[PDB]
Design a protein around this ligand. Structure first.
Ligand SMILES: CCCCCCCC/C=C/CCCCCCCC(=O)O[C@@H](COC(=O)CCCCCCCCCCCCCCC)COP(=O)([O-])OCC[N+](C)(C)C
Ligand SMILES: CCCCCCCC/C=C\CCCCCCCC(=O)O[C@@H](COC(=O)CCCCCCCCCCCCCCC)COP(=O)([O-])OCC[N+](C)(C)C
Ligand SMILES: CCCCCCCC/C=C\CCCCCCCC(=O)O[C@@H](COC(=O)CCCCCCCCCCCCCCC)COP(=O)([O-])OCC[N+](C)(C)C
Ligand SMILES: CCCCCCCC/C=C\CCCCCCCC(=O)O[C@@H](COC(=O)CCCCCCCCCCCCCCC)COP(=O)([O-])OCC[N+](C)(C)C
Ligand SMILES: CCCc1cc(O)c2c(c1)OC(C)(C)[C@@H]1CCC(C)=C[C@@H]21
Ligand SMILES: CCCc1cc(O)c2c(c1)OC(C)(C)[C@@H]1CCC(C)=C[C@@H]21
Lengths: 640, 231, 63
């Protein structure tokens, strides 16, 4: 293998003369040495076995200003000895790198000129790469282009090569990779925001679709049942989603491939009929379901401006969800009042036994429907939220924000009511402690129903983000000081002469924690005389607790100050639109078949000749940029 | 460049790529490979790690006569190098610290509210227990050994205090003293009580209150709490 | 910053055998007659492109 290793060193450096020298020798060699299987042994003297790497690969992996040459001498050599098929179509063999061919290397190293040669020489254009570096799971183990040479040219912004590969036949544009993705899914995969990758996926996602001329690639489910449209929604790619929905192909013969059919235009005013094929919840998983109920991404706020949704969210509220949100509040109001107008009349007395909420049995009519409404609606929450418990594929944060703080307290409230009626039934006196939490949890949870009511809605967000993030810290350090300084003053106190009982406020530890607790809130009375060994030390630990406590309270107002000036005006108004969206859809999931169909949005359209699809009209006004409006669906400018 | 605090020049010395051949040997940014956007850059750690004597990672951190030590620690054979040392060994040792310093104050505290809150003739507060059960033996004994342990150790941090330009005040030394004072007041008392003095109680109580407030120190490897203990 | 002092102050404590085990780095053939420690830091960059020529090892990736 001396001739083998030296030719590898030849393509490496760039020595063309030294290459042509051994070029003759391998030509002189194979005629008489190891004949009768010439092209196999000849190839075997070019294969870097245990890797599959041939000379042509070794040439283009290592680019030098003298590289266009060494390719040509090997290609003309492949022509003479007739190995041109297996020569170019050879691939690596190891699992870490499989399928990587010559065309795969040339498209990466920006040698677009050499690419045109290898394609014309008969390179398998619809190649693949099913290795590990080419299908990583974690980041920074490799690069996912999509197991086609076309994708690597498009993902890496090589439009000249994409056009050339595209025009050449045998270029199956409807191909599919290992994980089922076609060329369009992969472009949705590798696409970041404008801070990162500039815009070229938006431009290259356009170029392939315009020329394709069919509703084929945009309607392909990879393996898990996802189109490029749905895939863009799940991963959280906002820029590409803005294009897919609001796509106008003004050039005729491809107006059919649009979703922005302009109904008409009279000067500044125009009417754009967007489409709602797979955006509404009529079918299975859609944008409006994925965009809202997803939690594994972070930018769900920015997506809900994209505007066959925002108009679509608002109209669902005006129709049905505004009412159902209020019909909810009236029953949940009547419930707590019922639970409360039992709790302050029957428990505040004792004869032998009161039955608190059980089957009334010797009470008037007023109290029958009272107690009965509690148990049925108590079980009703107790069941329902439990399904929301179960369908809780882990909300990435936790029980904490984005919804699940509230579905538990609803659940806990329902359990504690029914739990008590079981406790009381056997014998137990523990019924009262459960009704009282059932009130206090209930009243504080009426605060929940403030989201379809604006500015209050933003206020119920700010309280929540504040009782998760800053106050929880302040307690945790306020505990350790209180419990810390609590012992110090609870131990410095000494003998309580029984002749002078209740000798001091600070006695046991339990009293020290509270009489310090009353001090913090601004309540009670203080006298530095309490029976102690050191009245000088007994105060220094107290004035200590005043200062050290006080300092954190200033860390409080500034830590929220450093939170509110950055967040509120953008934070509250936007996540409010989010949680309001879940409320709309969650009601739409409830509705029966006949009632949902009646309230289904949309209006039919003749967007083109052989094309009827749903729509949603959104008028607008625009003055700054003008045109001689030519793209009309219907020429008559206006309604009717 | 590290000692004087010159950040711009340090950014160049570490991340130097001499792409032109014949002088690639003079680099510290050897690219292992590159496949399109993804690449792998093998930076160097000749005199950046603490394997040898005074280095960047020792000078950049322990220096106080400059002001811009923050901006330097982004320069990135350090930031990656700081983070990996934590994941390996220092995350654990920081928590093994907190458990013993937790068990210490609880020990010091579960003596302070049971024996001092009574008086017969004399209680021996923390001395050699001598007619107590096993629970109280390892209790008192753990206090004195670990009390001396802080009392010694921080004292070396006292001595190796080429004046931290501010003072005892910020950038570290506010906390190494209260650790020291806490350790002194405990052992100081056991000496005071030994002779005859009644002053033992006043020292145990500061030993608690200083101790509990200094548990706030151990909040730095735990993020957002860590930023709160700075503010 | 203060987190950095905590890391090193612990590293100053560690005995000889335990420090050597936890020593970072990996050997490299950066050049012909040159072996030195290293630390791999991968990255991602999209805005500026080039026909990458400066390779230590030609095989693009781990292993
Ligand atoms: C976060 C902490 C937990 C939160 C809790 C939240 C709720 C607040 C909790 C309130 C509890 C209030 C007192 C309860 C009733 C008394 C019983 C008791 O506990 O004490 C008994 C023993 O215990 C002691 O004497 C305490 C000594 C150890 C202090 C531990 C503090 C740890 C904080 C570390 C923080 C780590 C920070 C880490 C930083 C990274 C003595 O009590 P007594 O005199 O025998 O009892 C009176 C008798 N009576 C009741 C009949 C009248
Ligand atoms: C024609 C009528 C036939 C009956 C249809 C019945 C349909 C009702 C649906 C599903 C039927 C099954 C009921 C299950 C009961 C428990 C569900 C539950 O929790 O509900 C909630 C109320 O949610 C509601 O949907 C309101 C229920 C009041 C009756 C509405 C009738 C009018 C609907 C047509 C109106 C058209 C008006 C538009 C203008 C033209 C109670 O709140 P919660 O316990 O905290 O629940 C969590 C959810 N939440 C926090 C987001 C609120
Ligand atoms: C600056 C203004 C803003 C901030 C202000 C600070 C805010 C608060 C910060 C911190 C809380 C501070 C603690 C206060 C406790 C005082 C009372 C005490 O310790 O002893 C007393 C009670 O003792 C108990 O009841 C023992 C504790 C029981 C466990 C429940 C703790 C409640 C905390 C829930 C946390 C909810 C978290 C949910 C929200 C996120 C006396 O003990 P006793 O003798 O046993 O009882 C007397 C009656 N008996 C003799 C008849 C039995
Ligand atoms: C194989 C084990 C053999 C033993 C090795 C012994 C090594 C220990 C080192 C030095 C030995 C000498 C000890 C001197 C005692 C006083 C020092 C001191 O203050 O310590 C501190 C704890 O600091 C620690 O280092 C933790 C000590 C607990 C034992 C750790 C054993 C596991 C080490 C291997 C773990 C590998 C796990 C990684 C995953 C694989 C106490 O806090 P402080 O008093 O306030 O001190 C100031 C410093 N501080 C504020 C920054 C915290
Ligand atoms: C008001 C914003 C939403 C809300 C509702 C609640 O029901 C409660 C909330 C918050 O905070 C906690 C969990 C601390 C409360 C504990 C006890 C009660 C009586 C109520 C709990
Ligand atoms: C909490 C942040 C760090 C800290 C720890 C402490 O130990 C103390 C701190 C601060 O402030 C002073 C010095 C005023 C305290 C004096 C008395 C006590 C009981 C504690 C002192």
């Amino acid at each position: 293998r001396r001739l083998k290793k030296r030719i590898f060193a030849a393509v490496s450096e760039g020595c063309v003369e030294e290459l042509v020298e051994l070029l003759v020798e391998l030509q002189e060699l194979c005629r008489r040495r190891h004949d009768e299987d010439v092209p196999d042994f000849l190839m075997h003297k070019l294969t870097a076995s245990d890797t599959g790497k041939t000379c042509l690969m070794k040439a283009l992996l290592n680019i030098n200003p003298n590289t266009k040459e060494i390719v040509r001498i090997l290609l003309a050599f492949a022509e003479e000895n007739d190995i041109l098929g297996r020569f170019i179509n050879a691939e690596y063999t190891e699992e870490a790198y499989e399928g990587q061919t010559a065309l795969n290397i040339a498209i990466e190293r920006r040698q677009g000129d050499i690419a045109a040669l290898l394609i014309a020489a008969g390179a398998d254009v619809n190649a693949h790469a099913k290795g590990a570096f080419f299908n990583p799971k974690y980041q920074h183990e490799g690069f996912y282009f999509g197991e086609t040479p076309l994708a690597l040219a498009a993902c890496t912004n090589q439009p000249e090569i994409v056009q050339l590969l595209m025009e050449h036949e045998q270029t199956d544009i409807t191909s599919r990779d290992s994980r089922g993705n076609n060329i369009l899914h992969a472009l949705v995969t590798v696409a970041e925001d404008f801070k990162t990758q500039n815009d070229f996926v938006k431009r290259m996602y356009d170029m392939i679709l315009l020329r394709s001329g069919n509703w084929e690639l945009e309607t392909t489910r990879n393996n898990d049942g996802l189109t490029p449209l749905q895939l863009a929604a799940k991963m959280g790619k906002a820029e590409i989603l803005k294009y897919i929905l609001s796509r106008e192909i003004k050039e005729k013969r491809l107006r059919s491939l649009s979703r922005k059919f302009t109904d008409w235009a009279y000067g500044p005013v125009s009417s754009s009929l967007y489409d709602l094929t797979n955006v509404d919840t009529t079918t299975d998983n859609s944008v409006l379901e994925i965009t809202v109920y997803n939690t594994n991404i972070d930018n769900r706020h920015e997506m809900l401006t994209l505007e066959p949704l925002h108009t679509l969210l608002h109209m669902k509220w005006k129709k049905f969800a505004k009412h159902m949100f209020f019909l909810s509040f009236c029953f949940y109001f009547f419930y707590n009042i019922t639970l409360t107008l039992v709790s302050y009349y029957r428990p505040r007395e004792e004869e032998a036994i009161p039955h608190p909420l059980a089957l009334t049995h010797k009470m008037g009519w007023l109290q029958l429907l009272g107690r009965m409404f509690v148990l049925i609606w108590a079980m009703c929450i107790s069941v329902k939220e439990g399904i929301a418990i179960f369908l809780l594929r882990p909300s990435d944060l936790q029980s904490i924000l984005s919804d699940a703080w509230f579905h538990f307290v609803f659940f806990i409230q329902a359990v504690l009511v029914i739990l008590s009626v079981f406790l009381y039934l056997f014998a137990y006196k523990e019924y009262l402690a459960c009704l009282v939490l059932a009130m206090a949890l209930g009243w504080a949870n009426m605060l929940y129903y403030t989201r379809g009511f604006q500015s209050m809605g933003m206020y119920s967000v700010m309280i929540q983000k504040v009782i998760l993030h800053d106050v929880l810290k302040f307690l945790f350090v306020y505990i350790v000081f209180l419990l810390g300084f609590g012992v110090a003053l609870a131990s410095l106190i000494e003998k309580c002469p029984k002749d002078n009982k209740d000798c001091s406020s600070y006695g046991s530890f339990s009293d020290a924690v509270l009489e310090l607790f009353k001090l913090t809130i601004g309540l009670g009375d203080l006298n530095i005389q309490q029976n102690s060994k050191y009245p000088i030390l007994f105060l220094f630990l107290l004035i200590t607790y005043v200062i050290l406590t006080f300092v954190l309270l200033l860390n409080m107002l500034i830590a929220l100050m450093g939170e509110t000036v950055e967040n509120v005006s953008k934070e509250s108004e936007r996540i409010w639109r989010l949680q309001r969206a879940r409320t709309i859809l969650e009601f739409e999931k409830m509705l029966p078949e006949w009632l949902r169909s009646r309230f289904r949005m949309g209006e039919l359209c003749k967007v083109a000749e052989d094309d009827f699809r749903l729509c949603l009209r959104i008028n607008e006004v625009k003055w700054t940029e003008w045109k001689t409006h030519v793209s009309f669906l219907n020429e008559d400018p206006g309604p009717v």
